[PDB]
């Protein structure tokens, strides 16, 4: 009843959770493993492309 | 392919042969040439799950 005469903003703060972790997790859960290794190949070939 | 064999039969034909009739064989594996790349966070419910999935993939 006396909520107006208090300051509980410290008792209730916004969480520091990154939703990107849940997004990449759902992405890995949807993708297979051979595509992950393919993406490692895409990155390696992109590195050689930037090199040349 | 998995292995490479050698065969030195021509040592008998070599002139001034130091190794006549060299009836032995060398065998060498090939997994390096077949795969040269063989050598190679606060307890949230999300990042640890992501690490678990990444570890499963690498496993």
Q: How was this entry determined?
A: cryo-EM
Could you tell me where the DSSP H helices lie in chain A?
A: 19-30, 33-51
Chain B residues touching chain A at CB-CB below 8 Å: 42, 44, 46-47, 49-50, 53-54, 57
The token duo for B37 is 């790349």
Report the C-alpha gap between B58 and B41 in whole angstroms: 19
Q: Please, which residues have CB within 8 angstroms of residue B11's CB and are 6 or more apart in sequence?
A: B17, B19, B20, B21, B22
Residue with tokens 């292995």: B3
For residue B54, the chain A residues in CB contact (below 8 A) are 28
How many angstroms separate the Cα of B49 from the Cα of each of A20, A23, A32, A33, B45?
12, 11, 16, 16, 6
Report the C-alpha gap between B1 and B29 in whole angstroms: 10
Give the CA angle between residues A12, A15, A18 to the nearest 5°: 170
Residue positions counted in chain A: 52
The data reach a resolution, in angstroms, of 4.3
A10 touches B: beta carbon within 8 Å: no
- Do residues A28 and B54 touch, judged by C-beta distance below 8 A? yes
Report the C-alpha gap between B30 and B4 in whole angstroms: 7
Please tell me which residue of chain A has the smallest CA distance to B56.
A33
Rg (CA), chain B: 25
The helix/strand/coil state of B41 is coil
Report the C-alpha gap between A20 and A13 in whole angstroms: 20
Number of alpha helices (DSSP H) and beta strands (DSSP E) in chain B: 2, 2
The token duo for B4 is 């490479």
Among B44, B49, B57, whose Cβ lies nearest the Cβ of A33? B57
Please tell me which residue of chain B has the smallest CA distance to A19.
B46
């Amino acid at each position: 009843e006396e909520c107006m005469f208090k300051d509980t903003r410290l008792d209730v703060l916004p969480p520091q959770v990154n939703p990107l972790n849940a997004i990449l997790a759902q992405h890995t859960a949807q993708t297979p493993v051979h595509r992950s290794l393919e993406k490692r190949l895409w990155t390696e070939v992109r590195a050689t492309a930037v090199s040349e | 392919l998995s292995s490479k064999v050698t065969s030195g039969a021509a040592s008998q034909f070599y002139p001034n042969s130091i190794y006549p009739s060299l009836n032995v064989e060398v065998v060498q594996n090939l997994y390096a040439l077949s795969n040269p790349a063989f050598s190679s966070t606060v307890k949230d419910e999300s990042a640890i799950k992501l690490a678990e999935l990444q570890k499963e993939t690498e496993r």
